[PDB]
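Dear colleagues,

For the upcoming journal club I promised to circulate an example of a predicted protein-ligand complex. I picked one with chlorophyll A because it came up in last month's discussion. The inputs are reproduced below in full, followed by the predicted structure.
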Amino acid sequence: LDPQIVISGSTAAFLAIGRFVFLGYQRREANFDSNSTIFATNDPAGFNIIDVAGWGALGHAVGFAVLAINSLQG
Amino acid sequence: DIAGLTPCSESKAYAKLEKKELKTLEKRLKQYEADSAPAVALKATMERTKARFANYAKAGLLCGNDGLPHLIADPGLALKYGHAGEVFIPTFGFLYVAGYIGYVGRQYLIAVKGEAKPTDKEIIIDVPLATKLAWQGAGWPLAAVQELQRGTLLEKEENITVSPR
Amino acid sequence: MKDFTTYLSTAPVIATIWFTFTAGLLIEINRYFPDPLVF
Amino acid sequence: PFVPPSWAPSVFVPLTGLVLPAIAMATLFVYIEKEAP
Amino acid sequence: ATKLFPKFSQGLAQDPTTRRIWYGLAMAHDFESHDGMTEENLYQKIFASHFGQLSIIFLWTSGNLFHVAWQGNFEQWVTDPVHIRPIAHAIWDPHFGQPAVEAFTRGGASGPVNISTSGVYQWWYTIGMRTNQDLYVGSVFLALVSAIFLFAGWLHLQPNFQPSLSWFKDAESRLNHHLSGLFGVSSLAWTGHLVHVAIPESRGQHVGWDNFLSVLPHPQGLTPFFTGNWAAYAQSPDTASHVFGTAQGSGQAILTFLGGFHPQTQSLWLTDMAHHHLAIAVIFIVAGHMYRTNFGIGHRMQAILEAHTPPSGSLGAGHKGLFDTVNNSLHFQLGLALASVGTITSLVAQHMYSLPPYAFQAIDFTTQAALYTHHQYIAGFIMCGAFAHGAIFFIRDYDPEQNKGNVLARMLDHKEALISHLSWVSLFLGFHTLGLYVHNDVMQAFGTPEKQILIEPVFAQWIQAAHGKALYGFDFLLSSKTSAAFANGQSLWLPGWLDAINNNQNSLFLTIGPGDFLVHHAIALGLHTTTLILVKGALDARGSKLMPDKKDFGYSFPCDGPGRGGTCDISAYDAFYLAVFWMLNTIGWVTFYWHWKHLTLWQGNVAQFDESSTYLMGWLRDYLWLNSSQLINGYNPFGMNSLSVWAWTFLFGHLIYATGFMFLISWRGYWQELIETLVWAHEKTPLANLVYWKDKPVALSIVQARLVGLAHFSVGYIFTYAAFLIASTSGRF
Amino acid sequence: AHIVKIYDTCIGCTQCVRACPLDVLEMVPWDGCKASQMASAPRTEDCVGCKRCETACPTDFLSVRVYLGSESTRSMGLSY
Amino acid sequence: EVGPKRGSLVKILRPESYWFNQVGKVVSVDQSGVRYPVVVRFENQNYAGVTTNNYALDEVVAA
Amino acid sequence: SIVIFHFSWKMQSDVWGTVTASGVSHITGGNFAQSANTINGWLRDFLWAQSSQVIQSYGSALSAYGLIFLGAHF
Ligand code: CLA
Ligand code: CLA
Ligand code: CLA
Ligand code: CLA
Ligand code: CLA
Ligand code: CLA
Ligand code: CLA
Ligand code: CLA
Ligand SMILES: CC1=C(/C=C/C(C)=C/C=C\C(C)=C\C=C\C=C(C)\C=C\C=C(C)\C=C\C2=C(C)CCCC2(C)C)C(C)(C)CCC1
Ligand code: SF4
Ligand SMILES: [Ca+2]
């Protein structure tokens, strides 16, 4: 199994479901969840660097899990 | 069979234990005469031992590696392998007698509670009322279930004293 | 006799008679049914 | 190395058992009975 | 007049009696009760105390390492860890005569030394220590770390370094950093040590600070990790003929899940432990990103708590307001922490004896007995502390107006039902366990052992059969070969696990019978009764029908006087006091059971335990009387041996216990009158009245008496059992 | 010194004052009970904390309460 | 005339009282402006051996 | 209790015993003049050694004593 294809696909897929699917739900839950730093971005949907890092972390973890499971040959 | 145990009717340690008990009893019996009271008492004890071992092996009890019987407490195993007489039937028997005594005492307390001096009826037992309730307590599960369905078995929250929290 | 029956109806006398009856019943049961371990 | 000498227990055990407890006991006892101004 | 000590209480300082010293010593850590105490200062004092405790722990660890490297025989014990006894430290006692010097001279030493029972030798040998130089370096490093912690504790109290009150209440940040950093990064670092040092050292390759930067832990060198082919790391593991410490039969794998135990050391595989630490490190690191701190994403514990109320109204207001009543109450947090710590400690004791993690630890019987007993007693004390702090929370930090209708208020709403049901469970367990034991005792006394009641523990045996044990014959789950649960682990970990659980020579799920069933019921009785006393004392701490205003008297006070029939031991402190005895009794039963079962297993006769554990006479004669013959023979008119110290400790603990009985039975008044007579005698004696006291002599207070008696009781109990356990296990093996 | 407090439920029965063995309590005029008297504690510096007054109080709950405070020579009842 | 009738049965609502949520017979109601004019006598005594107490107008509910 | 313990040990050690040919043998062998000066001697030779009869009495005519020996500890 190609690691580059799996990692790239997993990261891009979870970033896509985070930007176009679960963005509104996450924003609505974060608002009701209620010294800090405001991360302003030019994204029209407010997809800042923090959300990118979180979704990319989830995508990389899932991609590496898939690669490991396929590496075990089971 | 169950939990690696063998029936007492086919256990070697069980028979060896019975032979050990009969051997020590016979050894103690050899020091007396034949028509004396201690000899008759020892022979009676030996007969009791033989009957006890025969009855335990006849009941189908499960013995361990020590030659002693074991009880089956699981309702499924007891009702599936013929061991309901160990712990199931005596459990329901105790439940009947326990609820019997509890219901008789509860009925006596509730009956003497509405009288002028209940403390006198508590230290000095009213034998006629207690005897009547003792004889009437045979239908305790039926009366208790009927009391529970009517809502009269329990007392309300507002009528019970509690701490100031 | 009323006072004597009232004295016999007290808690210790009733407890003594009841426990004697229960103990006697259990002893006689084990006497006529030696070594009952199961049903 | 960090290895202590052979005579180290013969000097540290009597110290920790008689020198240090006596000084500590005397100092603490004097401190407890100190009267406030 | 007013003395300088104590400085935190002017009322105690004005006390002109001996009660001032005792009370000042017993209330020094009660920071909330000092003079002029605020919340910020309170938290700062606790922060400094935490640093001081950490420094003490690290210095103690460094001292152990230093003594093992100096007076121990670690360099010789690693070559023969089966026939060589470990050495704790040397003995320099001028009171020892010639027989004591030659009696304690053992273990290949040149003088009198103590044989260790702590098991640090096996642990250090398993993690990678081989020479005394390693222990010396570790001791120096830990001493310097302890010094840094002490300096940090002093530095954080000075101005420009004291944390603010809001900093101490940052629950989200603190919990995220502890889950990701203190738990995940620490576990990841331990995985790195196991893969880089422990695993290569166990295969005969010395890897240290001088050569770890040039030695590869795996022949592929980090390539399978980056390429996602992690399955290559489990290739070529240690074979069944591997010798610990050498390269004979050693594999090249670093992360496996073979399961079971090592065939020689009878301990867990190092590769499996490293893999375990890596997996839990990944889980803890991921869990460290759950709460919102400063980047928008995350959660708020208050929102999760307030959003957990059932619609049916079964829990009332649910968990509303729980965030404020916990974050603002230090006793609640301490009680939760102590409860979790005690449970984890018990978990550690059970998992370490059943699943030995250190090499050549199962063969050391004394180490197993001492470690299990030590952890179980510590866990019992910690649990009692958790419940005590819960009672302290109810009296000092509970606010009914803020906690209105939530689960916390509903606990006090139906506390009578809880105490009543706990009483019923304890009564049922006590009556039945005692009745079955007395019945079995009478049957054994009358010569009819077949008439005793022996209930087979079918539930626990069924669980064991589910785990893979085929001795009972249930043949299901991991016991049946045609089950999916069995066939799904045959390629990962089930072979080694089944081979280790089916072996009756280890402590992995031992065979149980009627004696185990009965002693387990006794354990349940002890747990339920201890819980009953603690729970009742915590719920009745704010008041009951006898004392409707107990919350206004504090957590600890003597009584309410002899009025209302008597109010002896009415405070929550007294409930904890009575619960300590039940905790000691419960741990005594569990440790007695553990020691007897393992003694009969190590002696090769488990039938002795199986046949004598059903009647109390067997426990008193075959366990307490049979195993103390060598202990009490340590010193006699015919001479003495190395076991005389344990005999002296045995009698020492008995004396301390009996001394505690004095403070427990006799009460203050008699002693105060006696003291008054002694005061008159000293005041009217010539050549001696010139030396007058600075503190007026008075009898110990009621609370102080209870604490002193409890302390003597616990110390004597602990020392007596520890001496008997170590002496019996060491003499027998 | 110990803290002695009198609550408004005092019926002015004067039993707590008679039971006090060190002359701490007394009776003052009042308008909240039929007896028109109320217990007072103006000499708490001599109270030892025997709680005899609490035993002698007949109200439910008690009207006089004793809270153990700072111990001194008079509070510990020492003759030396 | 204010308060419960003499000889009636009332429930105690005072939480710190020993007879909280218990029935007691009314003895006498004081006609002055005292805080606790109702006198309630109970068959069961408290821990101090007392069977009578004084309660306020709102501290007792008819039951 | 200490009085009766001293009486029992002294009588069983230096007074009571069988009569053999040219010599008198006591129950415990006269160990009171050598083992009663220590607490360990009292606990081992008088309490641990002499309690063997009451703990193994089960199955004989003295078994009741053993039962009471346990009951009294309760
Ligand atoms: C007090 C707690 C308690 C405990 C710890 C157990 C424990 C056990 N029971 Mg059980 N049981 C209990 C109360 C309890 N029982 C009560 C109060 C009743 C009366 C209703 C029953 C009636 C009962 C029956 C009829 C059976 C068991 C059985 C079992 C054993 C396996 C089934 C199981 O774990 O699921 C829990 C048990 C139940 C929820 C009861 C229903 C039975 C389930 C559905 C299992 C049946 C499937 C099959 C027969 C399992 C056998 C597989 C293989 C060995 C052939 C197990 C050791 C089974 C057994 O081993 O047969 C000998 C069995 O058939 N029990
Ligand atoms: C009318 C008699 C009666 C009844 C119906 C109950 C019922 C109950 N008791 Mg109780 N109890 C009783 C008498 C009674 N008790 C007496 C006399 C005592 C003093 C020894 C106690 C002491 C007691 C304690 C300490 C506890 C209970 C508890 C309980 C509850 C749990 C069940 C249980 O079996 O506990 C156990 C029952 C006992 C230990 C005592 C049983 C004594 C006998 C068998 C009862 C009848 C005796 C009486 C002389 C006969 C009436 C004579 C009359 C016909 C002339 C239950 C509702 C538990 C609880 O708090 O509730 C959850 C609990 O902890 N009881
Ligand atoms: C907490 C850890 C600890 C413990 C329990 C012990 C225990 C012991 N040590 Mg050891 N020691 C330790 C740490 C420790 N040491 C360290 C880290 C060093 C390296 C500096 C040494 C160096 C050392 C030597 C050279 C010797 C001992 C010896 C001994 C034994 C004699 C008694 C004694 O105290 O001697 C003295 C102990 C010391 C000099 C260490 C004290 C230095 C630390 C930094 C002070 C700690 C302060 C403390 C925490 C404050 C509270 C304590 C108290 C005031 C309440 C005794 C069994 C002697 C021996 O072998 O007997 C046969 C001996 O010769 N120790
Ligand atoms: C914890 C540390 C500790 C240490 C290091 C010692 C050391 C010693 N003890 Mg001691 N002891 C201790 C604790 C200690 N004890 C405790 C806690 C108790 C109470 C249970 C006792 C009760 C005790 C008794 C009853 C006796 C000893 C005796 C002795 C001496 C053994 C005699 C011998 O064979 O050598 C040879 C003896 C000598 C070479 C003579 C040395 C003279 C002294 C000891 C040194 C010089 C005095 C010094 C200048 C002053 C130091 C005080 C200082 C704190 C200011 C020895 C030097 C015996 C003794 O005193 O000898 C007569 C003895 O009778 N001890
Ligand atoms: C990643 C950053 C980080 C790290 C590493 C730490 C680390 C630590 N903090 Mg800290 N903290 C942080 C961030 C961090 N904090 C932040 C950002 C805040 C502000 C919001 C705080 C606020 C804070 C406070 C208020 C306190 C601490 C405290 C502590 C110490 C806890 C002491 C302890 O329990 O031992 C270490 C605990 C563990 C290693 C976890 C053990 C897990 C279980 C219990 C054991 C299982 C392991 C294994 C099986 C056992 C090994 C066996 C064998 C080897 C013996 C600890 C050293 C306390 C302190 O200051 O002490 C001085 C404390 O009071 N911190
Ligand atoms: C993380 C653990 C922890 C922490 C931080 C605390 C913290 C606190 N506890 Mg606590 N507690 C704990 C665990 C803990 N506890 C445990 C495990 C128990 C069960 C044993 C208790 C039971 C407990 C009670 C009952 C009470 C407290 C109280 C207190 C508070 C102040 C009292 C104090 O500590 O003064 C200083 C502590 C002492 C001076 C200890 C007393 C001396 C002991 C008995 C030493 C004896 C050992 C002996 C000498 C061993 C040597 C033997 C050898 C020579 C042979 C304080 C906030 C008190 C309180 O809240 O005030 C109202 C209170 O009453 N605790
Ligand atoms: C061997 C000593 C001993 C024994 C037997 C007990 C027993 C008991 N304790 Mg206790 N405890 C002890 C020591 C002991 N404690 C000590 C030293 C302390 C520290 C002060 C405590 C502190 C303590 C507290 C704080 C509490 C208990 C509680 C209990 C009860 C728990 C319920 C139970 O298990 O039901 C089983 C019942 C029994 C074991 C009673 C024995 C049955 C007898 C032998 C049968 C009667 C014999 C025969 C029929 C008649 C003979 C009498 C004759 C004169 C005619 C129980 C009766 C808890 C409680 O009250 O529960 C509600 C409670 O809260 N204990
Ligand atoms: C084994 C436990 C124990 C012990 C040691 C004591 C000890 C004592 N009791 Mg006591 N008592 C006990 C149990 C015990 N009792 C119990 C359970 C109760 C409840 C019923 C009582 C009730 C009681 C009463 C009512 C009275 C006493 C009195 C006394 C004192 C009598 C004076 C004496 O004997 O001279 C000598 C002292 C001893 C023998 C105690 C041991 C001293 C050791 C052996 C010396 C060791 C010294 C050592 C070197 C110290 C160094 C320390 C080192 C760490 C630095 C004495 C201290 C009486 C009293 O007040 O005094 C007249 C008194 O009237 N007791
Ligand atoms: C008083 C108080 C308190 C409390 C305390 C406590 C609460 C204690 C306790 C206790 C405890 C100490 C507990 C514990 C517990 C545990 C649990 C609850 C568990 C569990 C389990 C499970 C769930 C499991 C499962 C399983 C199995 C079965 C096996 C295999 C695996 C698995 C997972 C599957 C506080 C302080 C808070 C405050 C307030 C007051
Ligand atoms: S005893 Fe109570 S009610 Fe009577 S006068 Fe004193 S404080 Fe008031
Ligand atoms: Ca090395």
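Two points we might discuss: The CA atoms of residues 8 and 26 of chain G lie 5 Å apart. Residues 1-63 of chain G form one domain.

See you all on Thursday,
B. R.
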